[PDB]
Amino acid sequence: KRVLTGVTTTGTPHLGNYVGAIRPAVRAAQNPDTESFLFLADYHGIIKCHEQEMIHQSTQAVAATWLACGLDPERTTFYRQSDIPEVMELNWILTCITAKGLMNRAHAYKAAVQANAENGQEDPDFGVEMGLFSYPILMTADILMFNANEVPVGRDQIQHVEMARDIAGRFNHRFQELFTLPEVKIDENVELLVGLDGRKMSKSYGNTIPLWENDKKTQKSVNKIITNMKEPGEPKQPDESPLFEIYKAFSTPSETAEFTQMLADGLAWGEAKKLSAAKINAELAELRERYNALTSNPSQIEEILQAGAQKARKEARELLDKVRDAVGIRPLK
Ligand SMILES: N[C@@H](Cc1c[nH]c2ccccc12)C(=O)O
Numbered sequence: 075k076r077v078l079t080g081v082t083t084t085g086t087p088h089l090g091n092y093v094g095a096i097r098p099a100v101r102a103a104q105n106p107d108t109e110s111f112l113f114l115a116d117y118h119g120i121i122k123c124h125e126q127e128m129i130h131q132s133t134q135a136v137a138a139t140w141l142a143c144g145l146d147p148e149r150t151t152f153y154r155q156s157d158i159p160e161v162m163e164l165n166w167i168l169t170c171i172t173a174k175g176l177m178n179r180a181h182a183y184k185a186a187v188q189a190n191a192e193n194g195q196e197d198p199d200f201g202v203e204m205g206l207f208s209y210p211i212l213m214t215a216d217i218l219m220f221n222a223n224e225v226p227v228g229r230d231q232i233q234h235v236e237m238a239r240d241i242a243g244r245f246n247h248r249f250q251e252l253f254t255l256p257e258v259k260i261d262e263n264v265e266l267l268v269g270l271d272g273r274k275m276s277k278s279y280g281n282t283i284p285l286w287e288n289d290k291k292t293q294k295s296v297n298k299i300i301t302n303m304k305e306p307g308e309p310k311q312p313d314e315s316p317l318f319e320i321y322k323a324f325s326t327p328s329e330t331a332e333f334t335q336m337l338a339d340g341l342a343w344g345e346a347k348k349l350s351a352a353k354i355n356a357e358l359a360e361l362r363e364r365y366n367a368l369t370s371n372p373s374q375i376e377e378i379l380q381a382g383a384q385k386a387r388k389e390a391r392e393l394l395d396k397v398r399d400a401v402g403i404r405p406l407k
Pocket of ligand 1: 078079080082115118213216225227231
């Protein structure tokens with residue numbers, strides 16, 4: 075039972091990525107009944123992003139984040155997409171059996187087209203580059219290259235797996251059945267983490283809390299959460315500030331219940347914010363020490379990534395030779 079996930083290397087992870095993705099995934103990859111695959115989608119980074127060191131810095135920070143949070147490379151095959159040349163070969167092969175209409179309907183592309191039309195732009199493809207048009211095929215290669223059974227994705231990403239199933243089927247039928255049809259994996263128990271202003275925490279919203287900061291900075295961050303004008307003795311209900319959902323994401327059911335009655339008995343916001351930052355700090359204190367260790371010694375991350383690549387390519391090449399033979403690429407004998 076092979077479980078496979080791609081993560082972007084396009085920025086530095088925040089608390090929201092920790093609660094909603096990283097922390098659940100690290101726990102979930104400990105199941106001995108699954109084989110665990112996680113890669114950095116660094117070649118997806120050049121689809122749109124362009125800053126010189128953005129990919130390299132986000133790669134180092136995303137790799138250090140997952141490591142610092144307990145991702146075990148002895149358990150998880152952990153690698154950069156840019157260290158698997160087989161994926162790029164597979165990407166061309168799948169391109170040859172993918173219908174253009176499938177890419178016409180890819181959501182990211184439909185959004186670029188509608189945004190031109192929302193902006194009075196009568197050319198639907200204005201500004202569209204082929205990375206945006208074709209990345210669903212590369213994502214399919216990322217998955218099929220290792221014949222993943224389950225691909226843990228958000229709701230947002232469900233189309234992308236359904237597209238891989240579509241391409242896998244068409245390859246299987248045109249050539250031969252080499253690709254298992256991958257399956258979405260969704261956990262309806264991960265609460266997405268709210269930001270400082272009530273909305274879901276997201277880099278594009280400017281409502282994020284950094285994941286890797288010292289206590290005093292984590293405190294100053296927490297002190298920006300929207301509160302209300304209730305008095306240090308006034309009854310505070312939990313639905314009144316995002317602070318409560320923040321405290322909740324870092325506390326047992328019992329502690330949050332205690333926090334509720336604490337608020338209900340008239341805990342001031344300054345103390346509440348103070349307690350929330352401490353919970354966050356307490357959960358993160360050790361991880362933050364490992365993150366600083368790794369980011370200060372990146373060659374340790376590079377070693378781990380090379381060992382991952384070595385493991386990944388061995389299984390990539392086993393499948394690719396089958397695929398190469400199925401599409402007619404064969405030695406002269
Ligand atoms: N496209 C995904 C990341 C990703 C790339 N390739 C993948 C393959 C499998 C799962 C996820 C991925 C995202 O935007 O977050």
